[PDB]
Design an enzyme around this catalytic site. Structure first.
Site, PDB file in Angstrom:
ATOM      1  N   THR F  32      26.916 -28.253   3.814  1.00 30.39           N
ATOM      2  CA  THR F  32      27.920 -28.832   4.692  1.00 30.39           C
ATOM      3  C   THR F  32      27.346 -30.028   5.450  1.00 30.39           C
ATOM      4  OG1 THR F  32      27.444 -27.525   6.674  1.00 30.39           O
ATOM      5  CG2 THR F  32      28.779 -26.492   4.960  1.00 30.39           C
ATOM      6  N   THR F  33      28.237 -30.775   6.094  1.00 28.84           N
ATOM      7  CA  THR F  33      27.862 -32.006   6.773  1.00 28.84           C
ATOM      8  C   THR F  33      27.414 -31.718   8.200  1.00 28.84           C
ATOM      9  OG1 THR F  33      29.531 -33.160   5.448  1.00 28.84           O
ATOM     10  CG2 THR F  33      28.587 -34.348   7.315  1.00 28.84           C
TER      11      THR F  33
END
Lengths: 242, 249, 246, 111, 241, 245, 244, 195, 232
Positions: F32-33
């Site tokens: 994920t970011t």
């Protein structure tokens, strides 16, 4: 077979991991030059900050090992910082145990012996870094000593390391052959910095701004790195020359 | 974690230790070095092949002092030779001088270095040393001696020999030129002649290293007042002396 | 050898565990049956020559007066396990002045099964090549029979067969077991299943019987009583006629 | 030198009847000629209808009580919540005490 | 340091190193043991009969672990020496802690346990040795003969053989050994042993080495002349046919 | 010439690369970011939490970790490796404090983590870390934001981003650096981080996400690392929702 | 990690052999020839130097024959460095036995110690075995004159006359043809020299290519005589192999 | 201490050892054999601290029997004495040293000669024609200095030992409840039935 | 795959640890278990699996502390090891700090314990998935733990074979069972329905069903045998 994977001899008598670490030393694609003045020692390196999200003050491949010894690294920054920490610890321990500051050549020989230990033992891999230590030794004067991932180390009147190392080396060679001396006959360290930057501009054939260079200077009992504005002043002086 | 606890040098079906032969191969590609035993001294010599003229060739010594009466030279991988000289000095001090109050004789020091190298060829997680050593020493009960140590851990006593690239051509030249009555200067001259063949570049006092195990040099002791303590037998020749002897080739 | 000793297969199993299970499949036959009157353990001796003194085949061992064990497979490995069991039992007595529960002893034995691999406390190289039937009795869970594998897993069986005939034997066990089974019935049942799954003609020399009862504890049947029970089962099977051909 | 032992006084009493037991203790914790607290109990219920008191050195008594409670907890964990027999608890307490045979718990114990 | 798992399981349920050690056993000189009514005989095969060999100092195939237990082996000689040293040390330790010499069964079980540990430990290979342990329990006249294999299995035998050509000798023994009538005299036991050996040792009697064990620590090695007497007596009966 | 240089860690390939490290970086890119933005008096960290199912308890399953009382760390990639690295960093900080009294400076902590990872890329018996970590805080020399890659390489950033939508974030960050030479404020940095997480979520737009923001500001948090919660969190979320739609 | 690089030096072949043991035996077969002969009044050791050069100081050279104590000597075939390691350990073990029991070490005890060391190297540790074969010649008050041999396999045996190294088959054939139980030390010397001269891979036997040793009884005390270059040349010219 | 005496006669060695072991003010046993047969031709008598004596004796016995089995050979008495001396000298500087004194008597068959060694708990070994441990020597030695003769017979040695035992029973404060007397010669070890 | 699935120390070119995924598959090939919590209780419903009809049903729910327990799916020995470690951690909490170990901290410890094995040579990842129920000072909590080192808190979840049916039942019943506050039997019935939503050719019996309940004023208790007959 596997003679290419660990630090064992190939049938030709070569260690392929050492050669591959040597090749990795150029991964940064940065060229470094080092020269000796009359009473100082200068190191120039290319500062290449591609990302603007980067803090340009944190990007550096020159390290202050001790109050007297400086070290410029050609190679990836992880192994660079590893060698930097190890050299700082060795210098501190030497100062504590033997009562005087660790000499340039002595630290270079210690790091080269460590690299050799990596060359002969399997569990340790070589460090893909070329280490140039520079100082003004109280016994030897201006000192430039360089080590490689093969465990080899030697001192130079002036040296260069990087992708274009051969060009810079040939430039310095020609200059010294014309001058017939082994140093830069100049009393001021700023002029030796200007000489180094000028000859690197001549060899590499590119113009530098203040944010394109790292300049380390070693004088007797001090090693420092120049700020962006001092480098800019040196570049101005160079531009105003003939 | 050093999980490499197994031998890296094993026997092949042909009865060959591969890493030993490969270390010998790495030695053969090294610069030629040689040693010659005379009646009143020994001589070791090699070529100081620098990488760039910017590099100071004197800072790197191929001839090193082990004891005040024992020196050594090599052919092969520089770093292995350097760490071996360090280990040899330490073992000469600990395993002898700190026990008998005197420096070890040449044979015993060579045996210790051979033990180190054999352990390098049999211990776990290590390759053999990529060097061959020529050690010239002097002790009171055996006189002068010249020994050769190979990566296999074996050592041999030589009246005169050479190792490296131009070893064979050098060795033959020594067979036709050596005798059991040479003086030290004769051995120096023969060593310079034998080396001049196995060199390609310039041939002067700044491109060659040469040391002698000859007479005692009390001027190099640094202190006077002990008649039983004489000077060291090991002495590296200065470039001036090398060029002076070359002027009369 | 190209992979580690504690490596998982793409199906999610330990290679060495399955291989030891195969070795157990190649082992001798051991059948246990637990009833409200006691547990019975019977093993196939499998003497590989007529000159082998069949008495020296101890595939039924005593862990404690209330815990007996039968082995199947590489019986040599079982030696060490048996020791760890016996001491543990006595230690639980010394520390608590009481008998150790059957499940507790079985769990302590299984705690050794997966104590293998590389690395290193140094552990053994390979898992055990023997499976165990651990029968016992305690005042908490009555009579109990447990199957212990080198997988670290143990089950509790009302009746269980391990070894060569362990597949076919198990089927017949499922068909011949009920909660009202008596001790003599379980003895004769073990004898019959052994006679079926054994390659040799079953007598008192290639088979061994034992029983755990609350009264007398763990007792291994001598050759004479086992032979008498064999004759009894022979008479029973010979005189049975539940057929309807026409 | 540092003295690793101390005395907190106190008195405990244990009686066993037909179908019952009783363990009583004074609640006075003292030191030298001074009172530390007037209500610091030292007769504890450990479960499985087993009451314990280790009177003497307060630190060692508390340590032993905690060790025995932990031992009964792990005995329940490792033996299918089997009830800890009073004789079994006594044997385990004997082993707990003899563990420090050469640095003993300066306490007299009664369960 | 070195804990590489050398003896591991194979996909078919086999520990290869153990089987290869058994194969090394099958390549060693033959050894046989026979039980009498009150004596045990151990016979062994000599590697042909070389002339430059000094027979006064070369170790014999039968080695004493204690005063009342003997051990023969088939396979690698060095592993046999290791097992013999461990067994002698354990015998002395059992004497020291129990004030009673060990039983043949106990020593046999110790050797088998050592081998089993060597089949399940890291960084080590199993023993390339199979052993025949013979003797008499202390203050007991019942003969005792046991066999251990590299796999760690041990078992008692009325008569047994290990090593090369052990199949033929085992067949001969299963043929000429009546459990109801074991060799009552020491001479009968020695004769059966030398015959079983001569079924495989085509060479002369020098190739046979016989030792006899009798209760209360009576261990005696037979001379070559006695072996020659036995072989001549058995051969004369064979020619009669 | 040859094959097999990527089957063992620390083995250099003929070109001069540690292929296992690059495979770890690839494993990072699958995560994920997570971003970090250095403002004038502190730093703000933000991370996207992929909502695998509605069964997950919201506002739980925290992804940002704290070191000492002034360092914040958020890692994209293998969450367990990031947790292990955070534990080691906490040990390093505890040692530094116990020996030198003062809380560990951000650059020192960065170098400690970097040496740890670089050691983890030195032997064939240890796997390189499978996470990229963005950390930092306020020390005696002001604000510091650093990002560390599985290679042991770490750098100080004006803004950093890693994960799937990293490029998206790496774009937006480059805008701010150009449009605010004077520097952002802590609250504005929080709003911009919410916006950038919302924008970078489009690269992993398959499932819904939960925003998680923390910050260490000399004036807004008095130099302490604190999780943005409540009204400020809702303000940042509304700002991002308005800017994207 | 490092498992792919482990050769596993102590594992069995499918037939039941030790790979490294056989390969080291091959390496030894490719080495110099050594011959021991036991006589009724002494023992003799002879060995051929494979290192041949006119510039080799053969005086201060002892590469084939070594002293363990004052009553036991060894002839080596194979790697000289492993040989020297084993010789140092053997001398230390002999001196430890002396310090413990105040008696000289019996030969078989030292031989079995070295053989057990070798086997330990051929069973655990994962290290390469010692590529060395030893011919022990000794005297103890129990068995008198003794000649033993040991190989990398850890097995040791005894012999009246034996050979190790190169051309062992032809050497054994010649020795078996010419050996007698009643020979003397001089007969053993002649036999060893003739066998070496017939099984040499060089032109002819010369003093500079030979090492010789004799353990004798000549009084009641044993003498361990390591032959000097001139002594070897004299015994060669006397036996007729050379002339001067 | 206890009575531990030894006398080396031509072709024999005689060892005498008190039979009494007393703990506290009570004589616990009056028939204690304070010897251990190290080998068929080597016996060792011992005395010292309770516990350490029998422990050290049986340890030495186990080691000597293991050496005898391993080599199928009997160590000379000199070698056994040297081994015991080295063991004691290593023990003295350990954490808890052995406090045991030993007399070792053996008939060396390779020399066909009797030998007697005295070693204390420190590791001081001596070969003497006669020896004793504890206070016993303080008397017996004198007698021997007057009555010993190298060419004596085993019966004469037994009579000399009887004289020593009489002197001890006369002038010793402790009642050692007689002695066990053993003879070691070429035919092994025997025990005098009536002393 | 073939050249990257031999160790847990080797990364695939795509950035995958295959041994971890093989352990996860070992979980997927195990008996089914389900967990569900409200705001006052937490229930684990486990379907014990048997070898044959003459064998017992292997236990699947283990008690860690008087306020916290877990259910296993996969390798029983690894579950025992992890549960013993969790017991030790809760015990250390209670003894050193007189404190009940928080479920979140227990999940953190289990995650770190697994990450230790998923990065070091000479070791395998655990081969079991865990569902942890616990009532602490923060209320009721349910955690799902995979040997990859990932632990997540959920209102309800399930693992084992065919766990998707139970997961979808909980996805729909979330708003319903999250409100079962102060009624243990109703939450147990909801869990039984969830686990029935993952059955293929089988019916729940007292022999194959295990229940576990924890909550306010309710210690972590296990129900087996006749005790579960009230839900069949």
């Amino acid at each position: 077979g596997y003679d290419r994977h660990i630090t064992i001899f190939s049938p030709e008598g070569r260690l392929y991991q050492v050669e591959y670490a040597f090749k990795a030393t150029n991964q940064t694609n940065i060229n470094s030059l080092a020269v000796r003045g009359k009473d100082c020692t200068v190191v120039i390196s290319q500062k290449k900050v591609p990302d603007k999200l980067l803090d340009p003050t944190t990007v550096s491949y020159i390290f202050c090992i001790s109050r007297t010894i400086g070290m410029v690294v050609n190679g990836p920054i992880p192994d660079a910082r590893n060698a930097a920490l190890r050299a700082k610890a060795e210098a501190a321990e030497f100062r504590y145990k033997y009562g005087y500051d660790m000499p340039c050549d002595v630290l270079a020989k210690r790091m080269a012996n460590l690299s050799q230990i990596y060359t002969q033992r399997a569990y340790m891999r070589p460090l893909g870094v070329i280490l140039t230590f520079v100082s003004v030794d109280e016994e030897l004067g201006p000192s430039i000593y360089k080590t490689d991932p093969a465990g080899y180390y030697v001192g130079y009147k002036a040296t260069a390391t990087g992708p274009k190392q051969q060009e810079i080396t040939t430039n310095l060679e020609n200059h010294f052959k014309k001058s017939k001396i082994d140093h830069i006959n100049e009393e001021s360290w700023e002029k030796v910095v200007e000489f180094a930057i000028t000859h690197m501009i001549d060899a590499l054939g590119t113009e530098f701004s203040k944010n394109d260079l790292e300049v380390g200077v070693a004088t007797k009992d001090k090693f420092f790195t120049l700020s962006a504005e001092n480098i800019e002043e040196r570049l101005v002086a160079i531009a105003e020359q003939d | 974690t050093d999980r490499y606890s197994f031998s890296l040098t094993t026997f092949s079906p042909s009865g060959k230790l591969g890493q030993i032969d490969y270390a010998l191969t790495a030695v053969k590609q090294g610069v030629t070095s040689l040693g010659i035993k005379a009646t009143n001294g020994v001589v070791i010599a090699t070529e100081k092949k620098s990488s760039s003229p910017l590099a100071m060739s004197e800072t790197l010594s191929k001839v090193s002092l082990l004891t005040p009466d024992i020196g050594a030279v090599y052919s092969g991988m520089g770093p292995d030779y350097r760490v071996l000289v360090d280990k040899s000095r330490k073992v000469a001090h600990t395993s002898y001088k700190r026990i008998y109050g005197e420096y070890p004789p040449t044979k015993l020091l060579v045996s210790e270095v051979a033990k180190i190298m054999q352990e390098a060829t049999q211990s776990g997680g290590v390759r053999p040393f990529g060097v061959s050593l020529l050690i010239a020493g002097h002790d009171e009960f055996n006189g002068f001696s010249l020994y050769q140590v190979d990566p296999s851990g074996s050592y041999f006593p030589w009246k005169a020999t050479a190792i490296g690239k131009g070893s064979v051509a050098a060795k033959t030249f020594l067979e036709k030129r050596w005798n059991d009555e040479l003086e030290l200067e004769d051995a120096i001259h023969i060593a310079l002649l034998t080396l001049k063949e196995s060199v390609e570049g310039e041939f002067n006092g700044d491109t060659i290293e040469l040391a002698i195990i000859g007479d005692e040099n009390p001027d190099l002791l640094g202190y006077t007042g002990i008649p039983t303590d004489k000077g060291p037998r090991f002495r590296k020749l200065t470039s001036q002396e090398i060029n002076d002897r070359l002027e009369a080739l | 050898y190209d992979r580690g000793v504690s490596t998982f297969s793409p199906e999610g199993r330990l290679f060495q565990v399955e291989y030891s299970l195969e070795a157990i499949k190649l082992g001798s036959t051991a059948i246990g049956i637990a009833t409200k009157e006691g547990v019975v353990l019977g093993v196939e001796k499998r003497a590989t020559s007529p000159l082998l003194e069949s008495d020296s085949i101890e595939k039924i061992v005593e862990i404690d007066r209330h815990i007996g064990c039968a082995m199947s497979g590489l019986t040599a490995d079982a030696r060490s396990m048996i020791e760890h069991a016996r001491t543990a039992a006595v230690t639980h007595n010394l520390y608590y002045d009481e008998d150790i529960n059957v499940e507790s002893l079985t769990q302590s034995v299984c705690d050794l099964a997966l104590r293998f691999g590389e690395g290193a406390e140094r552990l053994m190289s390979r898992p055990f090549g023997v499976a165990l039937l651990i029968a016992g009795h305690d005042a908490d869970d009555g009579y109990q029979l447990f199957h212990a594998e080198p997988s670290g897993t143990f089950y509790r069986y009302n009746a269980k067969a391990i070894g060569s005939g362990s597949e076919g034997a198990q089927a017949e066990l499922l068909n011949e077991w009920h909660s009202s089974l008596t001790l003599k019935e379980a003895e004769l049942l073990v004898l019959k299943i052994l006679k079926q799954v054994m390659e040799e003609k079953l007598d008192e020399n290639n088979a061994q019987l034992s029983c755990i009862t609350k009264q007398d504890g763990f007792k291994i049947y001598d050759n004479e009583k086992t032979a008498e029970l064999i004759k009894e089962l022979k008479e029973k099977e010979a005189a049975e006629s539940p057929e309807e051909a026409d | 030198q540092f003295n690793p032992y101390g005395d907190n006084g106190g008195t405990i009493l244990g009686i066993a009847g037909e179908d019952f037991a009783v363990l009583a203790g004074d609640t006075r914790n003292i030191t030298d000629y001074s009172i530390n607290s007037r209500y610091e109990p030292k007769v504890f219920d450990c479960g499985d209808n087993i009451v314990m008191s280790a009177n003497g050195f307060a630190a060692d008594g508390d340590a032993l009580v905690k060790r025995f409670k932990n031992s009964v907890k792990w005995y329940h964990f490792d033996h299918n919540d089997k009830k800890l027999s009073i004789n079994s608890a006594a044997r385990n307490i004997q082993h707990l005490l003899y563990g420090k045979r050469f640095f003993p718990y300066y306490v007299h114990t009664i369960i | 340091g070195y804990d590489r798992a050398l003896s591991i399981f194979s996909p078919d349920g086999h520990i290869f190193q153990v089987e290869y050690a058994l194969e090394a056993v099958k390549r060693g000189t033959c050894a046989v043991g026979v039980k009498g009514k009150n004596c045990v005989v151990l016979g062994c095969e000599r590697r042909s009969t070389l002339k430059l060999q000094d027979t006064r100092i070369t170790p014999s195939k039968v080695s004493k672990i204690d005063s009342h237990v003997v051990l023969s082996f088939s396979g690698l000689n060095a592993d046999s020496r290791i097992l013999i040293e461990k067994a002698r040390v354990e015998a002395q330790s059992h004497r020291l802690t129990l004030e009673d010499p060990v039983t043949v069964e106990y020593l046999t079980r110790y050797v088998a346990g050592v081998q089993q540990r060597y089949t399940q430990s890291g960084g080590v290979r199993p023993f390339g040795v199979s052993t025949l342990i013979a003797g008499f329990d202390p203050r007991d006249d019942e003969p005792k003969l046991y066999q251990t294999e590299p796999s760690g299995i041990y078992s008692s035998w009325s008569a047994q053989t290990i090593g090369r050509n052990s199949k033929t000798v085992r067949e001969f023994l299963e043929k000429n050994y009546d459990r109801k009538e074991p060799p009552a005299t020491v001479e009968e036991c020695v004769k059966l042993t030398v015959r079983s050996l001569l079924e495989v040792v085509q060479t002369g009697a020098k190739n046979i080495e016989i030792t006899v064990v009798k209760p209360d620590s009576d261990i005696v090695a037979l001379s070559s002349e006695e072996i020659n007497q036995y072989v001549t007596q058995i051969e004369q009966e064979k020619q009669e046919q | 010439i040859g094959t097999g240089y990527d089957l063992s860690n620390s083995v250099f390939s003929p070109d001069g690369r540690n292929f296992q490290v690059e495979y770890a970086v690839k494993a990072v890119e699958n995560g994920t970011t997570s971003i970090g933005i250095k403002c004038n008096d502190g730093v703000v960290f933000a991370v996207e939490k992929l909502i695998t199912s509605k069964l997950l308890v919201p506002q739980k399953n925290v992804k940002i970790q704290v070191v000492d009382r002034h360092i914040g760390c958020v890692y994209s990639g293998l969450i367990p490796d990031g947790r292990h690295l955070v534990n080691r960093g906490r040990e390093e900080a505890a040692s530094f404090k116990k020996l030198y009294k003062t809380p560990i400076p951000i650059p020192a902590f960065a170098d400690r983590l970097g040496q740890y990872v670089q050691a983890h890329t030195l032997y064939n018996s240890v796997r390189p870390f499978g996470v990229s970590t963005i950390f930092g805080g306020v020390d005696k020399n002001g604000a510091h934001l650093y990002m560390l890659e599985p290679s042991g390489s770490y750098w100080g950033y004006k803004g950093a981003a890693t994960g799937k939508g990293r490029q998206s974030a790496k774009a937006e960050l480059e805008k701010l650096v150009d449009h605010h030479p004077e520097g952002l404020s802590a609250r504005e940095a929080v709003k911009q981080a919410a916006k950038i997480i919302y924008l970078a979520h489009e690269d992993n737009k398959e499932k819904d996400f939960e925003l998680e923001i923390s910050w260490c500001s000399l004036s807004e948090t008095n130099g302490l690392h604190k999780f943005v919660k409540g009204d400020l969190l809702q303000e940042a979320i509304d700002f991002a929702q308005k800017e994207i739609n | 990690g490092s498992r792919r690089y482990d050769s596993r030096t102590t594992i069995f072949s499918p037939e039941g052999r030790l790979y490294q043991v056989e390969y080291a035996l091959e390496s030894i077969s490719h080495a110099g020839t050594a011959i021991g002969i036991m006589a009724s009044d002494g023992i003799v050791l002879a060995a051929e130097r494979k290192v041949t050069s006119t510039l080799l100081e053969q005086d201060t050279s002892t590469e084939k024959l070594y002293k363990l104590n004052d009553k036991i000597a060894v002839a080596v075939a194979g790697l000289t460095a492993d040989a020297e390691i084993l010789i140092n350990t053997a001398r230390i073990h002999a001196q430890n036995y002396l310090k413990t029991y105040n008696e000289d070490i019996p030969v078989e005890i030292l031989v079995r110690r070295l053989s057990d060391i070798k086997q330990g190297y051929t069973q655990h540790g994962g290290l390469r075995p010692f590529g060395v074969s030893f011919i022990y010649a000794g005297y103890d008050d129990r068995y008198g004159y003794q000649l033993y041999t040991s190989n990398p396999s850890g097995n040791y045996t005894g012999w009246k006359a034996i050979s190790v190294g190169a051309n062992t088959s032809a050497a054994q054939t010649l020795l078996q043809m010419d050996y007698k139980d009643d020979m003397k030390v001089d007969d053993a010397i002649e036999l060893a020299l003739k066998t070496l001269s017939k099984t040499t891979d060089s032109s002819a036997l010369t003093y500079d290519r030979l090492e010789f040793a004799t353990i004798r009884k000549g009084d009641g005390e044993v003498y361990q005589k390591i032959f000097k270059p001139q002594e070897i040349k004299d015994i060669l010219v006397k036996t007729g192999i050379t002339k001067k | 201490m206890d009575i531990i005496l030894g006398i080396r006669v031509q072709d024999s060695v005689i060892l005498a050892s008190s039979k009494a072991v007393t703990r506290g003010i009570s004589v616990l046993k009056d028939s204690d054999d304070k010897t251990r047969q190290l080998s068929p031709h080597t016996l060792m008598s011992f005395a010292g601290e309770a516990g350490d004596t029998v422990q050290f004796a049986e340890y030495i016995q186990a080691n000597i029997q293991l050496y005898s089995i391993r080599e199928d050979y009997e160590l000379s008495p000199q070698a056994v004495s040297s081994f015991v001396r080295q063991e004691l000298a290593k023990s003295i500087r350990s954490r808890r040293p052995y406090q045991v004194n030993v007399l070792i008597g053996g008939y060396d068959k390779k020399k066909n000669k009797p030998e007697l060694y005295q070693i204390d708990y420190l590791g001081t070994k001596v070969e003497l024609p006669y020896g004793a441990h504890g206070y016993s020597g303080f008397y017996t030695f004198s007698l021997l200095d007057h009555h010993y003769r190298p060419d004596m017979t085993t019966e004469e040695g037994l009579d000399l030992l009887k004289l020593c035992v009489q002197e001890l029973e006369k002038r010793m404060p402790m009642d050692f409840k007689g002695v066990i007397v053993k003879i070691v010669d070429k035919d092994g070890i025997r025990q005098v039935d009536d002393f | 795959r073939n050249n990257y699935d031999g160790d847990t120390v080797t990364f695939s070119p795509t950035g995958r640890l295959f041994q971890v995924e093989y352990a996860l598959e070992a979980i997927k090939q195990g008996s089914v278990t389900v967990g569900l919590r409200s705001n006052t209780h937490a229930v684990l419903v486990a379907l014990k699996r048997n070898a044959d009809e003459l064998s017992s049903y292997q236990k699947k729910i283990i008690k860690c502390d008087e306020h916290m327990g877990l259910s296993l799916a996969g390798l029983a020995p690894d579950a025992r090891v992890l549960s013993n470690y969790l017991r030790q951690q809760c015990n250390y909490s209670s003894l050193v700090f007189n404190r009940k170990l928080a479920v979140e901290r227990a999940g953190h410890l289990l995650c770190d314990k697994a990450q230790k094995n998923t990065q070091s040579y000479g070791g395998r990842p655990y081969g079991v998935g865990l569902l942890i129920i616990g009532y602490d000072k923060s209320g009721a909590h349910l955690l799902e733990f995979q040997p990859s080192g990932n632990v997540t808190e959920l209102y309800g979840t399930a693992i084992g074979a065919r766990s998707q049916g139970a997961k979808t039942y909980l996805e729909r019943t979330l708003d319903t069972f999250i409100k079962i506050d102060g009624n243990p039997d109703e939450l147990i019935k909801a869990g039984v329905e969830a686990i029935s939503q993952s059955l293929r050719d089988e019916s729940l019996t007292v022999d194959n069903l295990s229940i576990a309940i924890v909550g306010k004023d309710t210690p972590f208790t296990i129900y087996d045998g006749e005790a579960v007959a009230k839900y069949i």
